[PDB]
Write a protein that binds this ligand. Sequence first.
Ligand SMILES: O=C(NO)[C@]12CC[C@H](CC1)C2
Ligand SMILES: [Ca+2]
Ligand SMILES: [Ca+2]
Ligand SMILES: [Ca+2]
Ligand SMILES: [Ca+2]
Ligand SMILES: [Zn+2]
Length: 316
Amino acid sequence: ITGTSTVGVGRGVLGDQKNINTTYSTYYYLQDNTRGNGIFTYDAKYRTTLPGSLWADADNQFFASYDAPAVDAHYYAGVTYDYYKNVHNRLSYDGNNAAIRSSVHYSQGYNNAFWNGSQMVYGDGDGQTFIPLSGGIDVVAHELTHAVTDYTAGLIYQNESGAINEAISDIFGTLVEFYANKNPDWEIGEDVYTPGISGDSLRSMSDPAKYGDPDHYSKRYTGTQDNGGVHINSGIINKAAYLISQGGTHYGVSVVGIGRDKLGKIFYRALTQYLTPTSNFSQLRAAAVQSATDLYGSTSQEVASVKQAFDAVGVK
Ligand SMILES: O=C(NO)[C@]12CC[C@H](CC1)C2
Ligand SMILES: [Ca+2]
Ligand SMILES: [Ca+2]
Ligand SMILES: [Ca+2]
Ligand SMILES: [Ca+2]
Ligand SMILES: [Zn+2]
């Protein structure tokens, strides 16, 4: 909407207070004009009709329980925008400052969140499996990274290409979590998963097998569930990415870590310059090797570590 840019205050899903960029025109709207062509957050009002209504508030204070998922969807979209702009010089998900739209309170008891091709959608969870999923910065950045992938490599969401697509979202969701530097880790969804159980998550990048996901190509899922295992076989690539960043010895193969920032540069370059819609794991290795070569040189430690990491997970 047309209006004047303002700054509200509210509390997110985990009870933390944060400032949020709003727009005033009679009401205060969750419309951040400071980032690109805007970040817009909507109330789906427990329905599945999208986007719902642009979030309007009478006093620019967002401390009601019902407000909390909107606060976090809005704020963490901004953090994710900032990460891509400041770290990779990418302006929103299309590189041309496309507006980022999110809807919260999607359906009833909905234990998921997703990019639908045009916008972000967040369930509130059923209170047992999940609390409102926008409370997880890695969730928000994971799904917004699907938008980045769709506008760049275009990896198809099935089989090995789809597992790469998923791993890219886990990698950059985790790197955004580290960027924001609040309780960062290499697990996915821990802030909103199972409020009754401490120390778990949906997936681990450092030890995918902690939750039953494969950590070596020989252990890959070969059936048809989950679009050919896109959230399962992502563990193989997630593990390689973890090893590139942090190092380790895995099935007897030693990897010298090169740190998160270089991991991010290597995989961002692979995603945007070398991967294609049907890339498989072997082609991802080649893309990462070439990316690290462009950035650091053929004889760099960085290139050697990329090779070791894919060796360690059995991807040639
Ligand atoms: O895997 C996922 N998407 O493909 C999810 C997205 C929301 C939950 C956190 C990560 C599941
Ligand atoms: Ca209010
Ligand atoms: Ca965390
Ligand atoms: Ca995490
Ligand atoms: Ca938990
Ligand atoms: Zn995903």
